[PDB]
Each structure stands twice: as C-alpha cells, then as structure tokens.
Design a protein around this ligand. Structure first.
Ligand SMILES: Nc1ncnc2c1ncn2[C@@H]1O[C@H](COP(=O)(O)OP(=O)(O)OP(=O)(O)O)[C@@H](O)[C@H]1O
Ligand SMILES: [Zn+2]
Lengths: 286, 50, 287, 191, 94, 139, 39
C-alpha cells in the first residue's frame, strides 16, 4: 500500500526543538504532535508538523488527551497560510513505543485515512538511521486476541529537497565525505555495510534469547523466514562459481590493466610538459 | 459608503504590470526561456502552482 | 547608544523556516514575524520564526493581523512555551537585501513599540551553501542625518569587518539603515542527527550492479575510448610547433583527447574496482 | 471571575437506557447539563464546558470548548450505550484537567453515575488518596438507578474531602423517576 | 532431513521409502510440483531429481539448537572477513 | 577546503538569466559575445564550461548585470518549430501530381537521394548539390 | 604510473604570487560603486 515515507530535516529538527522547549519538565514528557504533509504517487511525504499539549500519569497509563480545539485552530492557520499543506498523520517522540501509542492513532484517525505515526530519537546514536514510522493494521485472526491490532513498520528515510539543502549544507560546516571515487562506497557501505550486517545478525540473536527462558509465546510466525534463510543460504564452491568467477574476474582485470596502462603514459607526457617548462626557462630567465 | 469606495482605491492603486511575453520553449521543469515584445530573450521561471 | 557590534544570535530552526516560507511563495515578497528572547542592549537571540499568511495578490509587506498574531501569540503560550516578540522579516526574493521605501515604513511601524525591533531580509535564490544573503538591518534616524552627526559611536573592532553589498549601498544603507554582523547557534545535539541521517546508503555497496551489463558497459566506454586514443595519437603530433598559448585559445571549438581521456580512465577504474571487491566479500560472508 | 473550568462527565453506560425521567434520561440530564452550563457561563465568561465519559471507551466526544453547539449536536443520537468503567473515570477526569489552558483554575468536576459500578474500593481509595495528593475537589451527582445508598461513593467522597478538603459533597440518586430539575436544584444553589 | 550438501534423492529411494512403483513416482512428483510443496527438477535418464525448496514445517526447541550453532560460527566469518577490511582498508580512510 | 569553494561559485547562474551569443575569445577563458540586446561585449567566463562545447555560433548565457558568461545552451529557434509531423503532412501523394516525370524524378535525385545514398556521391565523388531553386509561372 | 607521478613534480616552481585582482582598480571599483550607490 504505502511504499515508504519522506522525512525532512525541517520536521526532524521541528520535533527536537519542541523536546527542548518542554525539556524543562525534567521528569517525564513524551513529545507527541500532529504530522502534516501529503502522500502522492503512493509515496508518503512529511513537510510540516506541530506538537499538541499532552500530559500522562504512570498510574492508569491508558488515558491520553489531545486539545483538538488547538488542533483545529492552528491547522486552520496552516491550511490558511498553505492550502497545499495538509495533515498526513501524527507522531510521538518514541523512545521505546509507549502504550497510549495504539489508540492515539485510533483517536485521531478521523482526520487521516492512513494516520501514520513517526517515532523519532531524542538522544541520537546508532549505526544506522534513527527515524521510524509504523502503520496501523488490524486482524480478526490467528490466536492472540479476537480484537487484535499491532503496528507494522514501513521503511523510513530522510527526504531531501532543493530548498532545504542550502540550509542543510550551510549548517553542516563540519565534515562531508565527498569526492565520490574509489573509496566513497568503501566507507559508506563496505566498511559501514558489514557492520550494517552486524546488527542484523545481532537482532536474530536477540530473538534467540527465548530458547527456554524468554517470553512464553514461542514461534508460530517467526520460523518460516528463519527456515527460509538457512534454506536460501547461497551455493557452495564446487561448480562454475570459481570457474565463471575466474572468467569474469579474468575479464575485469583486463580493463583495469588497460586503464593503468594509459595512466602512466599520460603522467609521463605531463612530465615532458614540465621539462619544456624547465629547460627553456633556466636559460631564458636565469 | 463614500469613504469605502475611496477606500477601494486606497489599495487598488497597487497592482504592477505583468510584461506581455511568449514561450519559446522549456528547458527543464523550472528553467524556461522566453522573449517579450520588447527585445532580447530571457531565461525565466514560474510559480510552483501555475 | 550602540557600539555597532550588535552580534545577533539566532538559531538553527529559524533559517529553515525562512528558507521554506521564503521559497514556497517565492515570487511574492513573503513576510512574517520573529519570536525570540530579547537579551541585553548589544545582542539579541531570536529563537523562533513563525510566518504570517498573506493578504492578497501583490508583492507587498501589506499589513499584519494582530488578531492572527494575537491568537498565534497565545497559541504556543498555552501549548508549548511562552516566548517574546522582537522582530520581523520580509523577503527580497532574488534581489539580495536592502530596505525599500515600503519596507522602511512597516519597519518604522515596528520600531515604535520597542526601539530594537529587527528588519530582516532573506534572499532564497542567490544562496547555495556558504551564501545566505540575510544581513539584518535596522533604521538609522534621518534626524541625525540632518545633524550631520555620525551615529553608532564605534568602540569595538567588530563592525567594520564585512563589506557592504553595492545593491544595498544604492539603497538607504548608509543613510537610513545599518547592518549587523550575525552568526548562528548550533550544537552536537543537532549536528550528528543530521550528518548521520542525510546521505546514508543501506545495502547498496553490497550488490552486484547489473552483472551482465557491468562488463558490457566496460566495453561501452572502451570502444569510443579507442578512437579518443586515436585523437590522443593525433594531438601530440602537432607539438614542436606554434606556441602552446596558441594551443590554448585554438582548442575551444574541437574536443581534446587529453582531458576527455583521463576522464574515462578514472571512470573505468572506479566502475570496476567497486564491483570487483563487492563481488568477493559475499563469497566469504555468504557461505 | 473566579478561575475554574467545568468538565462534565456524562454517563453513556448501558444502564442509562430507559425513558424513566419525564422525556428521556438523555434529554433530562442533557438539559440539566445545558442549564448548569448556562449557570457557569453566565456566572463567569471564562469557563469552558466539555464532556468526557467514563465508559469502556472514554471518548472526548466534545473537546473542552465554551461553545455548546458541539455538545448539543453530538448528544443527539449519541447512543449512550456501553460497559461502564469508572476506575478510569478518575484519571480520564483528571488528566484532561491537567491538559487545560490553566492549572491556576479551580479543578472542579461534576460526575454522573447511573449504573451499577464494579470498581474496587481499594482502587478508588488509591485514586482517592491520589486526588488527595493532587488537591482536586469533585462533586459527584448520581443519576438513574444504582446500588442504592451509593456503594463505594460515600467512602470516595469521604476520602476526597479528607485532609482539610472539607468542601465536597455527594448528591445521591433518588430511585424515583421524577422531574430531575429539583434533583439538581441544590448544586445550582449551593456547593 | 537431507542437508544442503546434496538433497538429491532417486526414484529407487522413493520406490523404497514410499514403496510405490517406478512408473508412478514421476506422476507423483509432477503433481507435487504442480501443487508446489517442493521445488526441484526432474531427471529421467539418471533417475534422480534435484529438489531445492521444501515446504517449511514447524519444529521444537531442539532445531533452534542446530540453527543457533550454524548461526554462531557464521557470525565470526563476518568478523573475520571484516577484519581484513578494517586492517587493510585502514589507511584509505582513517 | 577547496571543494567548499569549488561548487560555491555557481550562485551567479541563479535564475535571472539573459541570453547572448558567443562570438570569439581574445585568449583562454576571456571572450567576446553578441548579446540578444544587439550589442557586443568583452566578457569573462565560468571555468567549469567545457570550452570545446563552444562555437557553432554558440547560444550562451549572460549575467544580467555583471554581463559575463554563465552557461552554454542547447539550440533553440522560434520559427516553425520543426513541422510537428502529426497534423502537418499536407497529404499530397506523388500520384496526385500528374505530368511531372522529369522534374519529380530530377528533384528526387537532388534532395533525398544524396540524403540516403550519400556514399555514392561520396565514393564516386560527384559533388551533390548544396541548394536548389525552382520557379516558373504560378500554379 | 606512481613513478611517473613521483618523478613529475620537481618542475612546480616559480609560482611567485597568486594575485587576487588588484588594489587601485579595487579602489576604482569602490569609487564608481560609491558613485552608483549615491546615484
Ligand atoms: N498535377 C498537377 N500539375 C499541375 N498543377 C496542378 C496539378 N494538380 C492540381 N494542380 C493545380 O495547380 C495548382 C498548383 O498548386 P501550387 O500552390 O503548387 O501552385 P504554385 O505552382 O505554387 O503557384 P503559386 O505559387 O501561385 O501557388 C494547385 O492549386 C492545383 O489546383
Ligand atoms: Zn523587501
């Protein structure tokens, strides 16, 4: 249904500054607010947002309130200043999936059909992209409850924009691993990539924590993919993999050989262009 | 009402010209190229809604 | 008095609101207000920008709706946190920056409340990375212009550092308004969470890139690269000839083998080595 | 005038489903809400009146607004049907009053119970001493029918006006479908 | 049950393990490929079939031991092959 | 550090772009152009322009004020665009023209025969005609 | 190729001054700029 989401740096900071402006509460407050934007060509977009006044008590943590008058007036001001901009869903600050974040979506689903939530990060650290979005799916199914509803994570990324990149690259001024050559991919995905595979190997190990000791439901819907992985582990080295592999390596290194074969001659020509700049300058000038 | 009709010209005298031009071709989605009824040819953009 | 060292601290967010609101409705001079704490006589640190919707068709800074900034003012007072009105802005769109005669009047309406309201121009076209063209100004009194008295009584070597743009200097620049050297406030809280999140691939370097057409493309450069090497077997042959400054002017109609040649060696290099290494880590990582 | 904000907690439970008092319970307690919100409105223009419930799904049917047209529009064919859950009625009455425009207001709540309650008195004395720790005066007015000599409510109001609270009351329900205006003519006269 | 080393059975082995004749096991496995529980090719002249995909079944807390162990030394092959990347690719980018 | 400056310079090629036409250069990277305003100028140029993209008679881009080279352009003409080929054929068959056996075959030789069969003119080398004139009484 | 690089860079010499634009013509640019700015 929904392919993926588009998140901007403007909404990205536009949550964090609100976490700063309610950061004086000290004890506990989650930044929940209203997520604005479009979705076009089956691609979710997030352009604007604001935050709603919200409080919560730990005793009886099934009670939430959104001042929907404040939702009406300010979004009326936002449709007014920008008729193109509209609602796209909501968000909460999302450390660890708080429990009112099952009906916050069912509370305000009367505005957006796919009333999407976004989990953000307040203390930014990972080896990946700490931006999360779920989606609401419900099920009269299998065996958990006759009324069952659990969010499912749609893939999430930071959408860029030509307007905002002036501010992005303007406000970086720190470091930027450009000069995309033979080593950009080496570090963005060959150094960072295998350590990308590290945590994905680690998460199935975190599920493996229930061999006899973990939570009481066992598998049901985990083990078809698990059997599928070790079923679909790739082909071993006995056939033409090493052959045709040696064939195609044995063809790629031809092109490498030609490129290195030119490059030396080019730089040699350049040195001759220097010795003309030396020998007929030493006698001329002195 | 006499102050309101003369209040219509209190702000109504503020529209600016919109020089009569002509579309030569279109380079990219926002890069356009035109020439008016005046002289030379220009490279121009539009509004994002139009 | 002032010392012309006025050092405006703004934000990290207000720049983004100014570029977005200045960019979406860009051919009209869009405007709005500035919402930050007024610190001491010299500096001002304005943390937030909220925009105002326009009035009608027309490039103007027409009017404020104190209904709208009244309810807007108490809106965040009863949701977020209270702040303070200080300044205001508009948008000379693709101009640079100055105070027009229209801009100076609505400025003059805003200095009457507090004497240190702020005139702010954004120019969201001529700005790329290191360019923003902001330069917040404020009115100087034309009374003292009749006095012939030089204002602002420089006591710090902080004012006369930037040199003024001439398109502003055409305008009231040195007779009706002054510039302020500014900067921004950023922290590690923001830097990492935008640096680690903008251009990040996922598993792309761990792919093969069209394994029947990587090598096919590897011919699809070599084939014309041969004849480009025949131009390279051509252009050296008119040396020990007319001086190479003539070989600098003379080669602006027809292509060189020299630069075009070293281009494709880089291209065929980086195209091959990445697929070659990426093809071989998977043989160990996968079984 | 004086700083408060009225948050009426209507009873949309499945035991609020007869035509016993005059017209209907819905119009009876509805117009009761209308005249007491005209009382709170004309006594102080700052007070806004919204309605929350204490049902299985404690919906904000109307947002806390000084307008009553949303209240009158939603209360028509409102279907006040559902399983009563009073144990979340305290928190759903309270956390809205912390969501409000001013914590400087007097936290005043009227509560309508017209159904048999299945709460624990230990749970509402935990929530009652919680409201002692939150300094909240709630005046509970009983409607409909109930377990007569309202059970767990005298201990809740007693454990509400305790520790120098001493200002709250418990209007208990008469089990006669009379005209309900004189049933609430005492809270509109004195507190 | 057969590992991913071979998983190549023969029609004599079906004729033993299912005691059904030579001229009906092919009609059995064409029906099996039509249904789609198993995915493998059929050779007629070498009397062997190259079965590749099996329908996934369920399992107790004992198969997770073997899947855990085949996972465990598969971690350190990623550690080991990555270690040359960190060591040799150290000076390309610090 | 340098790559900060490298892409930085291209702000001048923003959007308020006026059009000239390249004429020649005095030297490397400083030139003379012919504006669409009618006057000609001695201008400077952006360094990233491939200079070997220049001069059929090059449609170039000028800064509106500082009046220097900005960008090289794909060609443009505002005449009959290109005879749009869909609703543009004047649906006239060769058979519609009766009695022009010599001249229809002769112009076929002159126009589209060297267009296709170019290497006979090249190979024998009989100098295929540049332009062709046709006249006579009207109708 | 590396040796055709390492043997190459001895030439780089007599690179005396990277003069930006000028001084007196900059004074004329701010002078005529001051004329157009007053104008
Ligand atoms: N086979 C034909 N040979 C000569 N003329 C013909 C033929 N068929 C029709 N005509 C008529 O002769 C006219 C020639 O058309 P055309 O417009 O080409 O004339 P023309 O030679 O261009 O003279 P003008 O320049 O005055 O138009 C047509 O209008 C048509 O009616
Ligand atoms: Zn302006």
């Amino acid at each position: 249904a929904v392919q993926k989401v588009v998140v901007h740096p403007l909404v990205l900071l536009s949550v964090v500054d609100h976490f700063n402006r309610i950061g004086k509460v000290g004890n506990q407050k989650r930044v929940v607010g209203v997520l604005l934007g479009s979705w076009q060509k089956k691609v979710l977009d997030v352009s604007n947002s604001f935050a709603v006044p919200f409080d919560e008590d730990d005793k009886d943590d099934s009670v939430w309130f959104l001042d929907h008058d404040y939702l009406e007036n300010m979004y009326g001001m936002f449709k007014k200043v920008n008729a193109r901009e509209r609602i796209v869903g909501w968000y909460h600050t999302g450390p660890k999936l708080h429990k009112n974040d099952i009906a916050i979506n069912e509370l305000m689903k009367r505005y957006c059909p796919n009333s999407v939530l976004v989990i953000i990060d307040v203390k930014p650290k990972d080896l990946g992209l700490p931006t999360e979005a779920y989606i609401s799916v419900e099920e009269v199914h299998d065996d958990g409850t006759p009324t069952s509803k659990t969010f499912e994570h749609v893939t999430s990324e930071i959408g860029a924009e030509e307007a905002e990149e002036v501010g992005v690259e303007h406000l970086l001024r720190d470091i930027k691993d450009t000069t995309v050559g033979t080593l950009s991919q080496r570090i963005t995905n060959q150094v960072h990539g295998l350590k990308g595979l590290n945590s994905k190997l680690l998460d199935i190990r975190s599920y493996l924590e229930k061999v006899a000791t973990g939570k009481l439901p066992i598998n049901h819907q985990i083990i078809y993919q698990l059997q599928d992985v070790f079923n679909l582990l790739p082909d071993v080295s006995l056939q033409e993999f090493v052959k045709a592999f040696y064939l195609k390596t044995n063809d790629q290194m031809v092109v490498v050989y030609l490129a290195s074969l030119i490059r030396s001659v080019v730089a040699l020509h350049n040195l001759i262009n220097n010795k003309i700049a030396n020998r007929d300058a030493e006698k001329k000038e002195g | 009402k006499q102050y309101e009709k003369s209040e219509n010209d209190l702000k109504a005298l503020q529209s600016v010209g919109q020089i009569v031009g002509e579309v030569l071709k279109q380079l990219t989605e926002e890069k356009f190229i035109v020439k008016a009824t005046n002289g030379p040819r220009y490279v121009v953009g539009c509004r994002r809604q139009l | 008095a002032v010392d012309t060292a006025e050092q405006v601290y703004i934000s990290s967010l207000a720049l983004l609101k100014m570029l977005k609101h200045g960019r979406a409705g860009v051919p009209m001079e869009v405007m709005g207000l500035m919402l930050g704490e007024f610190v001491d006589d010299y500096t001002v640190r304005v943390i937030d920008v909220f925009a105002m919707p326009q009035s009608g068709t027309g490039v103007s800074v027409e009017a404020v709706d104190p209904v709208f900034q009244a309810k807007m003012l108490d809106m965040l007072k009863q949701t977020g946190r209270p702040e303070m009105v200080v300044g205001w802005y508009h948008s000379h769109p693709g101009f640079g920056c100055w105070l027009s005669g229209v801009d100076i009047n609505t400025q003059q309406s805003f200095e009457a409340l507090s004497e240190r309201a702020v005139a702010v121009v954004v120019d969201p076209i001529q700005s790329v990375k290191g360019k923003v063209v902001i330069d917040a100004f404020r009115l100087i009194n034309a009374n003292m212009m009749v006095l012939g008295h030089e204002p602002r009584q420089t006591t710090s070597n902080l004012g006369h550092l930037n040199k003024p743009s001439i398109q502003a200097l055409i305008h009231g620049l040195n007779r009706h308004y002054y510039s302020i050297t500014i900067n921004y406030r950023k922290n590690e809280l923001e830097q990492k969470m935008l640096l680690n999140l903008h251009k990040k691939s996922w598993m792309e370097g761990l792919t093969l890139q069209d394994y029947s057409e990587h090598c096919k493309h590897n011919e699809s450069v070599v084939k014309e690269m041969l004849e480009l090497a025949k131009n390279y077997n051509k252009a050296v042959e008119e040396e020990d000839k007319m001086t190479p400054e003539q070989l600098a002017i003379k080669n602006v109609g027809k292509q060189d083998p020299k630069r075009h040649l070293e281009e494709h060696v880089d291209v065929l290099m980086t195209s091959n080595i990445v697929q070659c290494l990426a093809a071989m880590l998977d043989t160990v990582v996968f079984k | 005038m004086v700083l408060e904000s009225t948050m009426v907690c209507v009873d949309n439970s499945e035991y609020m489903r007869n035509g016993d008092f005059l017209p209907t319970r819905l119009q009876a307690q509805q117009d009761a809400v209308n005249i007491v919100c005209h009382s709170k409105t004309r006594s102080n223009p700052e007070n806004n009146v919204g309605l929350i419930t204490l049902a299985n799904d404690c919906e904000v049917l109307t947002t806390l607004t000084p307008d009553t047209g949303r209240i009158l529009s939603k209360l028509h064919t409102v279907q006040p049907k559902g399983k009563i859950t009073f144990c979340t009625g305290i928190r759903v009455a309270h956390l809205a009053l912390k969501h409000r425009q001013g914590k400087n207001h007097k936290m005043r709540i009227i509560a309508f119970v017209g159904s048999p309650v299945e709460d624990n008195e230990k749970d509402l004395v935990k929530l009652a001493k919680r409201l002692k720790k939150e300094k909240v005066n709630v005046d509970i007015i009983n409607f409909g029918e109930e377990e007569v000599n309202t059970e767990k409510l005298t201990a809740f109001v007693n454990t509400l006006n305790g520790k120098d609270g001493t200002g709250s009351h418990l209007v208990t329900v008469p089990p006669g479908p009379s005209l309900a205006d004189a049933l609430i003519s005492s809270p509109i006269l004195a507190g | 049950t057969r590992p991913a080393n071979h998983r190549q059975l023969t029609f004599e082995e079906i004729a033993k393990s299912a005691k059904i004749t030579v001229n009906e096991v092919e009609l059995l496995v064409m029906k099996a490929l039509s249904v789609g529980l198993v995915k493998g090719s059929i050779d007629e002249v070498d009397k062997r079939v190259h079965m590749t995909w099996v329908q996934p079944r369920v399992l107790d807390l004992q198969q997770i031991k073997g899947m855990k162990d085949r996972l465990e030394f598969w971690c350190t092959d990623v550690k080991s092959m990555e270690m040359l990347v960190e060591h040799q690719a150290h000076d390309i980018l610090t | 550090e340098f790559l900060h400056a490298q892409e930085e310079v291209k702000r001048i090629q923003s959007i308020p772009l006026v059009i000239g036409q390249f004429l020649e250069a005095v030297d490397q990277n400083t030139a003379i152009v012919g504006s669409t305003t009618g006057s000609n100028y001695y201008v400077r140029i952006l360094s990233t322009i491939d200079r070997e993209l220049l001069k059929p008679n090059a449609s170039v881009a000028l800064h509106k004020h500082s009046n220097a080279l900005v960008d090289v352009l794909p060609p443009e003409a505002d005449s009959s665009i290109m005879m749009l080929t869909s609703d543009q054929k004047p649906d006239v068959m060769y058979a519609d023209i009766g009695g022009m056996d010599i001249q229809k075959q002769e112009v076929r030789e002159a126009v589209e025969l060297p267009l296709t069969h170019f290497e006979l003119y090249k190979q024998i080398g009989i100098d295929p005609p540049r332009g062709v004139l046709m006249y006579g009484p009207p109708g | 190729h590396n040796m055709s690089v390492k043997a190459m860079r001895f030439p780089p010499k007599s690179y005396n001054k990277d003069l930006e634009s000028a001084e007196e013509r900059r004074e004329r640019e701010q002078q005529d700029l001051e004329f157009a700015k007053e104008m």
